[PDB]
Structure formats: C-alpha cells, structure tokens
Amino acid sequence: DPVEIENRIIELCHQFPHGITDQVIQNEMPHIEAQQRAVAINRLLSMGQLDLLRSNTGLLYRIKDSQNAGKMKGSDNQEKLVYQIIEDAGNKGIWSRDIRYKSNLPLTEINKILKNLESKKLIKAVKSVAASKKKVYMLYNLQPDRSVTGGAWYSDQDFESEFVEVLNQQCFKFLQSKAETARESKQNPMIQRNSSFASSHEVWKYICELGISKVELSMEDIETILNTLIYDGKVEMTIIAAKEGTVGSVDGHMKLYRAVNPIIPPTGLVRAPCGLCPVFDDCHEGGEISPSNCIYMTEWLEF
Amino acid sequence: EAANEAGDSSQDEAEDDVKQITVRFSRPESEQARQRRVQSYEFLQKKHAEE
Amino acid sequence: INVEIKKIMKANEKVTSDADPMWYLKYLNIYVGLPDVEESFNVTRPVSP
Ligand code: SF4
Numbered sequence: 001d002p003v004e005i006e007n008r009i010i011e012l013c014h015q016f017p018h019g020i021t022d023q024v025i026q027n028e029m030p031h032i033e034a035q036q037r038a039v040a041i042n043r044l045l046s047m048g049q050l051d052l053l054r055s056n057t058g059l060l061y062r063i064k065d066s067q068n069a070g071k072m073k074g075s076d077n078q079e080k081l082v083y084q085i086i087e088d089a090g091n092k093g094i095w096s097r098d099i100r101y102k103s104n105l106p107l108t109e110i111n112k113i114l115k116n117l118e119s120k121k122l123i124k125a126v127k128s129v130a131a132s133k134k135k136v137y138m139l140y141n142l143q144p145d146r147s148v149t150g151g152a153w154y155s156d157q158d159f160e161s162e163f164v165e166v167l168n169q170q171c172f173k174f175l176q177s178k179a180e181t182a183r184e185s186k187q188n189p190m191i192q193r194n195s196s197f198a199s200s201h202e203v204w205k206y207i208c209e210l211g212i213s214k215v216e217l218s219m220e221d222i223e224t225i226l227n228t229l230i231y232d233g234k235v236e237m238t239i240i241a242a243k244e245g246t247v248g249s250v251d252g253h254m255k256l257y258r259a260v261n262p263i264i265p266p267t268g269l270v271r272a273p274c275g276l277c278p279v280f281d282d283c284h285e286g287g288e289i290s291p292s293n294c295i296y297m298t299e300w301l302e303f
Numbered sequence: 304e305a306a307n308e309a310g311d312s313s314q315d316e317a318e319d320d321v322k323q324i325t326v327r328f329s330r331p332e333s334e335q336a337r338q339r340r341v342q343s344y345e346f347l348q349k350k351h352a353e354e
Numbered sequence: 355i356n357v358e359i360k361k362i363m364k365a366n367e368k369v370t371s372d373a374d375p376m377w378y379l380k381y382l383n384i385y386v387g388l389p390d391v392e393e394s395f396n397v398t399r400p401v402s403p
Pocket residue numbers: 273274275277279280283284289290291294296297
C-alpha cells in the first residue's frame with residue numbers, strides 16, 4: 001500500500017523537522033524496495049506536501065511549513081503561498097508592491113493576509129531606510145539587515161548629519177593631536193611617523209571612550225568615517241603588514257591613519273571674484289554682465 | 304559541453320551550490336494566460352505523451 | 355442594425371475585472387428603437403428628418 005508508505009514518510013518528516021535523507025527512510029523501512037520509495041516520494045512532491053533540499057550530504061526531504069500559521073482565516077493555501085516568498089526575501093525584506101506582483105493577487109487579499117500574519121507574530125513590517133516608499137515585510141525571527149534598514153547613522157529613516165560631523169571633527173582632532181605629539185617627540189623620523197600613525201582599532205576605542213552617542217559604533221563604522229576624512233583631503237591612510245595583534249581585523253594587513261597637512265595653500269584663482277563667479281559663462285565686455293559694473297568685484301574691493 | 308565547462312580545472316572543489324529553496328508561488332493564472340498555456344504546443348505534446 | 359450589431363454584442367457579452375472576482379457585467383439584448391429627440395426634459399419625442 002503506497003498510502004501507508006506516504007504516511008510513514010510524513011511521520012518521519014514530522015520526527016525530523018530539518019529533513020530526512022533516503023538512508024534514514026531505508027533504515028526505518030528496510031523491507032520496501034527503492035523503487036516504491038521513489039514513487040512515494042514523487043507522489044508526495046506532486047501533491048505538494050514535501051520539499052527537496054540539496055546539501056553536501058545529498059538529498060533531504062522536508063515537510064512543507066504548514067504548522068507555522070498566522071493567517072488561518074480563509075485558507076492555509078494562500079497563507080503559505082505568501083509566507084513562502086516572505087521567507088525567501090528574509091533579511092533583505094520585500095515591499096508590498098513586489099509581494100502583490102509575485103503573488104498575482106489583488107491588493108485587498110494581500111493586505112488581509114499581511115494583517116493577519118502580523119496579528120499572530122509571523123512577519124514584521126519595517127520602513128525601508130534606503131528608499132522610504134513602502135514598508136518591507138520580513139520574518140519575525142530573522143535579524144534585520146543593516147543595509148536595507150537600520151544602521152548606525154540612520155535614526156528613524158533620518159540621516160544624522162550632525163552625528164557624522166561630530167565624528168569627523170573628533171577623529172580629526174584626535175589625529176591632529178597625535179601628529180602634534182609625534183612631531184614634538186622628535187626622537188627619530190621613522191619613530192615619529194609610526195607614532196603619528198593611528199590604527200582603526202585605536203581610534204575606534206577612543207571614540208567608544210568618548211561616548212558621544214548611545215548607538216554602538218563598530219570598527220568598520222570608524223573605518224568608513226576615516227575614509228570620508230581621507231576623501232576630505234585632511235588625513236592619510238597606509239596599509240602595513242602585521243600578521244596578528246590587538247586589531248586582528250584584516251588578514252595580515254593593518255590600516256594606519258595620520259593627520260597630514262594639505263599639499264598647497266589655496267590657489268590665487270579663488271582669491272579673485274572671477275574664479276568663484278556662478279555666472280562666469282555669461283561674462284562679456286559690452287553687455288548687462290560686464291567687469292566694469294560687476295557687483296562681485298565691487299563688494300570685494302569695498303570689503 | 305557542460306562537462307567540458309566543469310572540467311576547466313583538473314580537480315574541482317566541492318561546490319557549495321546548495322539548492323536554496325526556490326519554491327515559486329503557484330500564482331492564480333489569468334484566464335487568458337491559462338487558455339494560452341492550454342493552447343500551447345508543449346501542453347499538447349505532454350498530453351499526448353501521457354498516454 | 356438588425357443582425358451584425360447583435361453579433362458584435364454577443365462577441366462582447368461578458369466583461370469583468372481581474373480584481374474582486376465573481377463580479378461581472380453581462381449584456382443580454384441590445385435594441386436601437388425608433389429615432390427620437392432629447393429636446394424635451396427627460397422625455398423623448400418622434401422627430402422627422
Ligand atoms: S561678473 Fe565680473 S567677476 Fe564675475 S566672471 Fe564676470 S567679469 Fe569676472
């Protein structure tokens with residue numbers, strides 16, 4: 001009786017929620033040949049009560065998620081036929097529009113399904129900080145990915161410019177003080193350069209000791225802040241070879257940051273009003289915009 | 304050709320190509336698209352092969 | 355006006371929307387009637403060419 005075989009396979013899948021191999025089924029039921037077990041598995045897959053997984057150990061057969069229920073009003077079929085791609089999205093989330101498009105259902109049905117799933121604590125809706133258009137839906141147990149939502153800089157879908165400004169100012173002050181101490185040490189140029197260098201872990205621990213904000217700042221956060229400072233033309237980073245130490249971030253490589261003065265002072269072009277003029281293209285000898293009746297140079301000479 | 308592509312290296316490392324669960328939604332098909340699928344040649348050939 | 359219009363109406367007798375199923379609009383029979391004028395307030399009247 002193949003029905004008994006299917007029932008036994010379903011019971012075995014109930015016993016092992018993580019899935020069962022063909023070896024487990026053969027050990028539990030040795031008197032049945034492999035062909036009958038294969039036909040039973042094919043029927044179970046055809047009727048939609050089993051799912052196949054391909055692991056490094058082979059093939060696994062897992063019972064389809066039906067016990068985990070959040071929307072039992074109506075049909076469990078649509079509940080699982082939404083929770084499926086809900087879980088498939090998982091940490092990255094998925095907007096309600098994309099859920100509707102993948103489910104090929106009207107807006108009312110999917111709204112009811114999402115509400116009922118939120119009622120029984122199966123899905124959580126979080127606001128997409130990348131593009132504040134709709135609320136993405138994720139699994140309640142899964143931790144929200146920092147890229148799609150949250151982040152040390154974003155606070156309630158609002159970028160904190162003051163926070164990053166304070167971070168940049170404090171890091172630059174620390175690096176400038178370290179470089180000043182290295183210069184005043186004047187023990188040896190190599191030693192001076194090594195002391196002016198500051199590791200990412202060191203400045204990260206310094207910022208943690210400062211405690212400007214309540215949110216915990218990881219090492220890579222301070223690394224990105226220092227990279228933005230590098231992009232400002234104020235500090236310099238060098239990658240040295242170090243197998244292991246107090247940082248242990250990059251394999252065999254450590255980033256050292258030092259405050260460095262600019263190459264050259266502001267050029268002579270910016271000291272003239274013509275170099276900073278926004279309507280410089282419309283300049284002409286005889287016309288409405290002329291150097292003779294210029295307001296910029298007038299205010300500049302008056303000042 | 305697939306075997307030759309796999310044989311680009313003499314020893315192939317055990318690929319971590321675990322089949323992520325790509326169970327697609329059994330979307331409710333529009334009646335026009337369902338009629339198109341029924342009138343498709345592949346559906347007729349499968350129905351003939353069923354016998 | 356006597357045969358072809360009925361065939362056209364039969365070809366498009368049922369119209370329905372994808373959203374909110376089980377809803378439909380079904381045409382049964384179409385008539386053209388006699389020529390009239392809409393001059394009178396909500397009342398028709400025979401009018402000569
Ligand atoms: S408006 Fe005067 S200062 Fe500005 S670009 Fe023209 S000439 Fe130069």
